[PDB]
Design a protein around this ligand. Structure first.
Ligand SMILES: O=c1ccn([C@@H]2O[C@H](COP(=O)(O)O)[C@@H](O)[C@H]2O)c(=O)[nH]1
Lengths: 228, 224
């Protein structure tokens, strides 16, 4: 008689973004990647066996969107160094700002995915989700995420590693190296970090899906990082 | 004097589908990788033997989608692409439909113009098939102001001097003297194509500028 809050998630959308700086700087998004995987494709992953297990093979059927976005303010020195992006370079390559057409693009990508759909992002609750909420709030469209759910993979992997704890880092790279005994690739790029996150979430797919189903919350409840 | 000016965006494109042209095939996967002209011009020039495989530019836009066809894949198609109608359906993929055109239009709108599609064998397969799929929709085609070229012709010109296979894999191994290691997916084929096109990036861009033609002139593979 105990039931899930929002049903079984049929799509997980792994999400990462890069931005101009840390939250108190009121940052703007400079890169976004979404990787949509159906529940069945995740639970089709070969069981992890051995120590270390091989890095899981990404499912054959996936949908991917990766975009670079011109910010309205400069990247901090540290942000440009870590991410490899700068306002100057995004402008010389004619990247457009975060605008209504981008919301329309995002909505049409999300609409191709079976519902219910859940965003999954590492530190999403403190960074990616509030910042995306802020960017979308500036636009004239409805939120393209208004019927989409979300979860933070830090909590998920803390739970999953407990089932298999203190001053163990739950950074993306730390987890990946603990699970697979190799370093990740293309760190601090939106698509590279989404692919690393997919690999971590393919470690124990059934357990990950159960945790996500139980912890998914509506994206519409995410408080913006900062306001107009 | 170029026919349509300097191309500001190259969009590397690959389509996978249910079969060969006489079967009246339907698209099962599409990948677009949009690269600004300056990002290609910034590719390092090795001038060594062998040249290292270029790495992709930092700034790229990418779209990869799986699409449910209305007809089954041939056995050959499923073997080569790793896709099937049944599996695409069980994973809830949608057809090539109006919402997909909204998505393609919005993605294209984020690229500086003029924009040129680049596809390996695109003149005989990918471009006519895409034309057919878009023609079935109510929406006017999002590609009617876009240009296109076939990268088989490009690499024939870039390798000519002033027997060779022009399969994607053969070209990559001939240029880089190592085997490709991208996945057998639409995105894998696009990444291999990008690497080939980064072998001589200024020369590739010059050939594309000289040979770009309007996508509106591509004849559909087949008609309703
Ligand atoms: O030392 C740091 C670490 C992270 N960030 C910001 O954190 C964003 C997202 O973090 P990540 O996805 O690269 O881990 C980055 O785009 C960047 O703007 C910094 O500015 N300085």
């Amino acid at each position: 008689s105990q039931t899930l809050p929002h049903g079984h998630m049929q799509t997980l959308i792994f999400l990462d973004l890069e931005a101009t700086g840390l939250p108190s700087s009121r940052p703007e998004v400079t890169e976004l990647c979404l990787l949509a995987v159906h529940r069945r494709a995740l639970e089709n992953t070969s069981i992890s066996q051995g120590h270390p297990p091989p890095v899981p093979r990404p499912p054959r059927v996936v949908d991917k969107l990766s975009l670079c976005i011109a910010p309205g303010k400069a990247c901090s020195p540290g942000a440009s160094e870590i991410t490899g992006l700068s306002k100057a370079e995004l402008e010389v390559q004619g990247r457009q700002r975060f605008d209504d057409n981008l919301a329309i693009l995002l909505r049409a990508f999300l609409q191709r995915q079976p519902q219910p759909c859940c965003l999954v992002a590492h530190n999403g609750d403190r960074y990616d989700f509030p910042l995306l909420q802020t960017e979308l709030a500036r636009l004239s469209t409805p939120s393209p995420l208004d019927g989409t759910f979300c979860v933070d993979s830090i909590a998920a992997l803390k739970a999953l590693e407990q089932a298999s704890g203190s001053r163990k880092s739950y950074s993306l790279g730390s987890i990946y190296t603990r699970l697979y005994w190799q370093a990740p690739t293309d760190s601090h790029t939106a698509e590279g970090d989404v692919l690393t996150l997919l690999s971590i979430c393919q470690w124990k797919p059934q357990a990950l899906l159960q945790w996500v189903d139980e912890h998914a919350r509506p994206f519409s409840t995410v408080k913006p990082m900062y306001g107009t």
